[PDB]
Design an enzyme around this catalytic site. Sequence first.
Site, PDB file in Angstrom:
ATOM      1  N   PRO A   1       1.587 -11.860  -2.173  1.00 12.41           N
ATOM      2  CA  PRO A   1       3.204 -11.930  -2.359  1.00 12.41           C
ATOM      3  C   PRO A   1       3.460 -11.350  -3.780  1.00 12.41           C
ATOM      4  O   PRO A   1       3.104 -11.989  -4.582  1.00 12.41           O
ATOM      5  CB  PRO A   1       3.660 -13.420  -1.959  1.00 12.41           C
ATOM      6  CG  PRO A   1       2.583 -13.628  -1.098  1.00 12.41           C
ATOM      7  CD  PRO A   1       1.390 -13.054  -1.585  1.00 12.41           C
TER       8      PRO A   1
HETATM    9  C1  6Y5 Z   1       1.225 -10.752  -2.174  1.00 15.71           C
HETATM   10  C2  6Y5 Z   1       1.841  -9.427  -1.909  1.00 15.71           C
HETATM   11  F1  6Y5 Z   1       1.751  -9.078  -0.405  1.00 15.71           F
HETATM   12  C3  6Y5 Z   1      -0.358 -10.436  -1.893  1.00 15.71           C
HETATM   13  C4  6Y5 Z   1      -1.050  -9.668  -2.951  1.00 15.71           C
HETATM   14  O1  6Y5 Z   1      -0.517  -9.030  -3.626  1.00 15.71           O
HETATM   15  C5  6Y5 Z   1      -2.550  -9.857  -3.002  1.00 15.71           C
HETATM   16  O2  6Y5 Z   1      -3.289 -10.089  -1.889  1.00 15.71           O
HETATM   17  O3  6Y5 Z   1      -3.297  -9.727  -4.042  1.00 15.71           O
END
Ligand code: 6Y5
Length: 59
Positions: free
Chosen positions: A1
């Site tokens: 996220p």
């Molecule tokens: C958060 C965005 F979808 C997840 C992310 O960036 C990660 O798994 O490192």
Amino acid sequence: PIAQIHILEGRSDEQKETLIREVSEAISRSLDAPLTSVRVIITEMAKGHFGIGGELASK
Ligand SMILES: *[C@H](CF)CC(=O)C(=O)O
């Protein structure tokens, strides 16, 4: 996220660091998402750069 939070300028570093921590924890808890997967971007807006109802934050 990945979260991006637009806030008005003027707050302390300490309060922004709290914001980052508490938002990150909320995302992680809500989603069962690993905390290290959570990125937060704070974007400060100058008071002359934010309108509500066509009127500035600086007014
Ligand atoms: C958060 C965005 F979808 C997840 C992310 O960036 C990660 O798994 O490192």
